[PDB]
Design a protein around this ligand. Sequence first.
Ligand code: CU
Ligand code: MG
Ligand code: ZN
Lengths: 143, 308, 307, 392, 248, 267
Amino acid sequence: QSLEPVAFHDSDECHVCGMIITDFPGPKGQAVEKRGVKKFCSTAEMLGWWLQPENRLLDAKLYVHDMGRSVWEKPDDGHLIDATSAYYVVGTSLKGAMGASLASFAEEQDAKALAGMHGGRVLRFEEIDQALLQEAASMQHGG
Amino acid sequence: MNAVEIQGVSQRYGSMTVLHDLNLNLGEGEVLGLFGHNGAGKTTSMKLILGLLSPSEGQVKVLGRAPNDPQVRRQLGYLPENVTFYPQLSGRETLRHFARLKGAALTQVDELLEQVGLAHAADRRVKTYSKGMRQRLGLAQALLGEPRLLLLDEPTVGLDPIATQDLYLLIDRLRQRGTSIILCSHVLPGVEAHINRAAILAKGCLQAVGSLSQLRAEAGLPVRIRASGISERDSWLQRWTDAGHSARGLSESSIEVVAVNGHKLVLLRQLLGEGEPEDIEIHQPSLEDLYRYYMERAGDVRAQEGRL
Amino acid sequence: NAVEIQGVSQRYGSMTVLHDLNLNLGEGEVLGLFGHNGAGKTTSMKLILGLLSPSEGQVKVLGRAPNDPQVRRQLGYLPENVTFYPQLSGRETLRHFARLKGAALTQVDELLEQVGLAHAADRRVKTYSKGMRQRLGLAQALLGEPRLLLLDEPTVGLDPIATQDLYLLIDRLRQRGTSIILCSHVLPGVEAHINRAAILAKGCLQAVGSLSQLRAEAGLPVRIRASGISERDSWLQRWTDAGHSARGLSESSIEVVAVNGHKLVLLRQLLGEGEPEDIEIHQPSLEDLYRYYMERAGDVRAQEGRL
Amino acid sequence: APQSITTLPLQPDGENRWRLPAGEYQGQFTIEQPMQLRCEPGAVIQSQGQGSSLLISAPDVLVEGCTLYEWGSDLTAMDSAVFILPAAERAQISNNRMRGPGFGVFVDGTRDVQVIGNEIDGDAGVRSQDRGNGIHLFAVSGARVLHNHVRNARDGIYIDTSNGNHLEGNVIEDVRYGVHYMFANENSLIDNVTRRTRTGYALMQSRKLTVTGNRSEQDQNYGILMNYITYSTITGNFVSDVQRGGEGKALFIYNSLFNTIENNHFEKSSLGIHLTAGSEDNRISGNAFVGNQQQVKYVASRTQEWSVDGRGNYWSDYLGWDRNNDGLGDIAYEPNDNVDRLLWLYPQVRLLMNSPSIEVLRWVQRAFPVIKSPGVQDSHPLMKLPTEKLLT
Amino acid sequence: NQVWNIARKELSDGLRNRWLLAISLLFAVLAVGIAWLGAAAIPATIASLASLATFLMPLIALLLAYDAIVGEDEGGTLMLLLTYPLGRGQILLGKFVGHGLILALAVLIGFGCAALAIALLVEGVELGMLFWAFGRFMISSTLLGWVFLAFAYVLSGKVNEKSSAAGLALGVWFLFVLVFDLVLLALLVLSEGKFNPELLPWLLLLNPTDIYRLINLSLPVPAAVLWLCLLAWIGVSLLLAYAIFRRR
Amino acid sequence: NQVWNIARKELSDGLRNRWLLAISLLFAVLAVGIAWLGAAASSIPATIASLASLATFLMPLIALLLAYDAIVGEDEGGTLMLLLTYPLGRGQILLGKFVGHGLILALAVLIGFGCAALAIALLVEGVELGMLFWAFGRFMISSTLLGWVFLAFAYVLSGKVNEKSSAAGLALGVWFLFVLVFDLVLLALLVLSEGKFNPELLPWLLLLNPTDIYRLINLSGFEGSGSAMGVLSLGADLPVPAAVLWLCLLAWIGVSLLLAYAIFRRR
Ligand SMILES: [Cu+2]
Ligand SMILES: [Mg+2]
Ligand SMILES: [Zn+2]
């Protein structure tokens, strides 16, 4: 039952920050656990939750949005790719919900499109670590 | 009427037969003596008479019944060897524990504590008892109720020299009532004065049964004449070897001479005639002397002069 | 003179548990200590061994002090019941006593062949019966030529062939000249082997001496059964005319009751004539002599079935 | 949508100062001129239920003593009670009573506005998803919101990207969030009281701000939630008895790198402090972790000293001594075992949590320190209560 | 009935055991000292009392009955008792009644002094819940003790010497209290992506100390199966002990 | 000499005790396991305070398992009353049992800390072999002395009692009191008084427990962390040097052996 990304409702709070998910732009990650689905207000808040040692061993599928086939202000539930096989761009000037703006893609050229259009660098899922999330959020919402 | 009717049993464990073709018949007031050295034939015939084992090739009839019926064991006492009871209980509470199981009346525990001589040492713990004081307790539970058969396995170990005689005095009172019992000892002098008929058995089989007069008549054994208070030893001691009698010298003036029962009269007159002993003791062939004959009768070669 | 106890009166707690005994033991005699009422059997057993101090009196073993190591190598003591060391073997247990007594190491094989234990040697003592531990306990007593054995019930739990072979081994050591003290409680059975008895009770030594001496100091009946006699006649009643009770038994037999100091003179009265024909004597036993001497000091006879 | 000049205001003073008499009114109203209007206590300006009731577009307006009632509820068109335009700089909204289903005080793009002493009762039936904010502040520099009384709104005092402003002494009751912070760099908030709230203090992505002296009485599931706050300062906060309705955490530090967390008082909660793995190496010293059923939750194996300058925190379950008579304890205090983090790493161990073998494993760590994972210890913990003033 | 006449012996012999009375005093002291530090410092203290009675009630049961059969065989009274009008079933079942009422009294002095330290040091304990949570506690602690009593009859009947009976009764106490649950914890840490999560509650039924705690915490299984699974640990192991005792 | 002839028995009788060889292999398989966990984390002052805590739980246990039935186990076995009728004294069959059981503890910890040192020089790369030999040389000649203390304790409680079933009850009482009750009574005295009962008497109570003097010897050079010491944190407040801590450990033997001889002399 872990194979199914469930859709988002308007009354869907984040797992961490607890506020309303669909009042925000940007891709919205969620985590299907196969014992209960928990959702997130931003993809950087999902990756902040994923890198904790309670959830490294947790067998749960991660699903983020496909921003190569969606408008950035209102992402449809629709195409919702697997988050391990994505291509996150970082460092763009787009205003995400909580963390740094991590636009998720699936085709890596559209990830290279937004990287050159804003001054960012494409990076895979395994290159994401907690030294990078705190570095990228400080450059976005600092100074 | 017979108490124990062992009719041709043969008890085995695996393939080896530890007891082969035992055939006994204990009377209604007799005292039987089971003596065994190598084999478990003494030990297995204990368990066969009780309900502990089952005859694999025969049957036993204790009081005309099977040995494991409840009407049998209410009239059967049994004292095992080296028993130690529950050490935290009292002496009286142990008998009041055993009186409930045999169905005995509770007006007998005060008597039987007095009847074995534990009235002074009752109401103390079993761990503060002697080895002989536990035998007074262990005999007391065998006399609970009105028993018809007693299996005393080594009853006089650790006991006083007087209290072992009063035990046999209590025994010889009981067989006059009609309670035929079984002595099972290893100290063979001491039981021969109170045994009625011996049942000396070998490693496997049953060697010989009968009274002491029958075993002395069947097994031709010599006769010991102990002569104390003679003039010299070697004046007579070199002479009995020439007359054909193995004689030793026991002290500075005392000898014993092993006659051959045809020489016993003429060797008797050579002491009162020649010389002057201060006392003359004549020993019959004892139960212990009959016992070593029957071991020689089936295997069991005698050891050296002093070996074992 | 092996054991010379002279004037020992042992006290503890001002209770005078032993009272002024003078027990001299010969250099080849085999004594027997039998005691029931007091602690005289067990206190005098320790006093010879030197592990107890004689208050108000002296004990002299082998002509020297009882606690010198020069005489403690010349003793052998068999205690009451000794489960020795249940993890060791038979040989290693006896070799452990071989080093302690200072005897030669070559005796451990000639004693485990002596006592019938060589098949059961090199095996753990927890798989030994009570007969084999008494067999093993004797083997340390015969270690390195003991001049004074001291056995405390050596025949308990032991099979009846080997009990008789123990006393024939005891009889071999008497002729070698080593005195033996037999402290036992199975008195019908040891009276064929001792040379002098020592009945002590209520502390005081009641009687000492040989078996014929105890019957001399205690007027007791004997049964003289004489089958195969003359004409069953005035010869029967003539000892009733002598002051006895001669039962005229039917089958050409007399049963005379005598007083045992007039014992042999009635014997050669009978066998001086030509028809004794395989008579029988019945002297009082050590069992009956024990109950007389015990009753003479403090004891009263019990009831018909009271013990 | 009429204007404020369509009412009947009696001038007390001729410096554009007006005074509205007692009596009800109707409809929306608009301020376009700098009018220092005061009000009698019977000035119930009750709108009909649509539109922003008192829109303000002019600078230097001292609105005082009004009583607004039943404005609109379209949160997308921002149907507020007091809408304040970006051109309406330095507005004062003093001592007002409000009851209506939308925003209480919606300001945006304003400077030096002072929202003082108001009572804003939000709603009763809406599901706390469309109630609107109590005091919404949207990117304002200079604001002074002081000593209000917000009840039953949605997410209390929402604040978005407003740089320098004070939140002093306001009581916030029965709302979803107590004070919400979004990207508010160099902020400040003092002595606020939050009661019965689904999160007492939301501190989301706001750096360099001072959170001091605040109180949180009986909130639900989150005492103070801090996400991505850097160079902050948490001094003197009293967080008490956050019951479930999360399991109840008095302080939940999530991805906050540098901040000074001193002299706080976390009292009678289920979790005293939750420290995530990403938020490490920040000065946490001098707090009072009293009465909590589990003091620190720290699922890591990295060591984390919790004592700057040799002074640590007071712990209620600190079974230690003090031989040399200073304030500090003598033995260090590890708040977490290894078996206290096996329960968090694997939730199936909750079935085995009462076993004696687990109770053996608590003793094996105290005897054999090689199996002790490096935790969240503090050398020199405090012996007495440092927050002797916050209990009053 | 002679199952009671031999039961009156084991009450009188078990209550004079100095080894038991030291532990039953230490059980009652530690039940007060947990209740004192659970009140001054009721579901929060009944879990710490469950970890206490999982330590000592297997230890009390194994101190009583490790020498029940083989201690009588070494004493020689076992061969004497079989010659009485008594089956081998009535000796074992009568010892189980006699040793059973001892530790059914050791929880009435154990928790009878622990519930007194709760009813007099909380002042507002709501005692209507006390007499039902401790009534379920005293019954379930006795049934835990009756399992290890029946475990002690299995290991006593198997061995032939009293020294090796205590070497197995210590081994049974190590295995069923604090080795079986440590290999449950060990399995989870070493294997986390292979071990079934659902299987572990079912696998908790192979340990009567674990079933003891599950009826003091009230879960895929219901409550009523655990009462019938704790009684199944008595009824199987007593039938196993009777099958061993008939093969001596 | 007679003291060696009775030592050769106990050296060959304790080595056939299967309960010894189980829990002396348990001391060996744990001293490798502690040193393997101390090698995988690198750390150094935590594997010293834990190895010294391992020999606090086991070297009193092997010593009391050996010698609780040394005198009274021979008295009710009958072989003690025989032994006094041999050319010996009571001082030779006690000092000989102390030498005989003492070489077992000298071998039971040479196996344990011997393989623990070989599980460091072959496991952690680049360890100081001079510091390793000195630290585990100090562990060997101080865990025997802790073992010889509880060996001499067991002769006191064997000569005092007169039944072997009651000697095991006293040996369990001595093992619980000195190992894991006196460190907790002293802990409970410090918490309930909040360290204000006596600021100068309380460090001297560590010398009334030989398991704590043993921990103070091995934790001399390696303090490291503070909470790992726990109730040993008063050891900095003891003004005695390291040589007196050896001498107070030897004095725990010599008083409790002379008491063991004076009890046995009036047995
Ligand atoms: Cu937010
Ligand atoms: Mg201090
Ligand atoms: Zn979120």
